[PDB]
């Protein structure tokens, strides 16, 4: 099991791997950074 | 004029004959237009019983509808139609201005 959390070189999978998070949260993070598959630097 | 029939070659022959008749005189005849052959397909299962690897057989009664136009008087068209003809080719004449 791996119950990831919500309350606390860019791709969603990577984000998930790193800080242990839901991928909706990863997406949100990505969006924030910027401010159906993803690629960011 | 609409020529409905079951037998292709016969129908074709009939069409040819009518064309020939037309070519005599006085007839602005549009060429024979054969229509989309709406094929009656029956897929029956062969074998009365349920024995044997159930083979079907696609029958096809393929009706040939044929169509042809003219600018003429009724009697003349009737005369033209009289090529003798027989029970096989079903003829229908339309004598409308429209």
């Amino acid at each position: 099991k791996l119950n990831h959390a919500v309350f606390i070189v860019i791709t969603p999978s990577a984000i998930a791997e790193k800080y242990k998070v839901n991928l909706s949260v990863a997406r949100a993070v990505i969006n924030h950074l910027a401010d159906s598959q993803k690629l960011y630097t | 004029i609409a020529l409905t029939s079951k037998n292709l070659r016969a129908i074709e022959k009939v069409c040819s004959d009518i064309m020939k008749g037309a070519k005599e005189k006085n007839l602005n005849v549009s060429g024979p237009v054969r229509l989309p052959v709406k094929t009656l397909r029956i897929t029956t299962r062969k074998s009365p019983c349920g024995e044997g690897t159930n083979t079907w057989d696609r029958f096809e009664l393929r009706i040939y509808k044929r169509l042809i136009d003219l600018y003429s008087q009724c009697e003349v068209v009737t005369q033209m139609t009289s090529i003798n003809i027989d029970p096989v080719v079903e003829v229908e004449v339309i004598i409308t201005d429209s």
Binding site: L23, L39, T41 | -
Partner: protein, 180 residues
Amino acid sequence: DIKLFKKWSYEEINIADLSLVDCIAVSQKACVYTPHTAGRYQKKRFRKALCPIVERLVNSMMMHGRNNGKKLKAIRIVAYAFEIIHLMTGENPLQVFVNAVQKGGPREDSTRQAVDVSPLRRVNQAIYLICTGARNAAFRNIKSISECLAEEIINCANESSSSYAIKKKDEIERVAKANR
């Protein structure tokens, strides 16, 4: 100019195998902009040799029943993988793919005793292996398919036994050795 994906040109690519060149044609008429060719690659024995490698990869990806006959999706996935390769682990993705292919073929196989492998067959195996591994990685993980596939490709290029395909190849080789 002639190009693939309007991005990776494959005039820069290199090979250095001979046999593999003979087998896989990325050539003058096997130039292509997007994998989807409606080519007649299986009406002859060796007509699969003319086939571009990207197309083959896409086909391989296409596997597994509930995802079968979804060419476009596969193509998209491969594009994504290529992009990833370009970005992270920076190199011409085509070159990487080629390297992976070179790596991938088991050179000797077992039979009912050890025998050698034709180049085309080896290439095919490599193509299969890479896709299968990727699929495995994807299945009931989270990661995503494109990312996983990309990772696999990179591993193949490296020639490192962390990925599955390479491991399989190694195993096969070992078996062959044991046989003869």
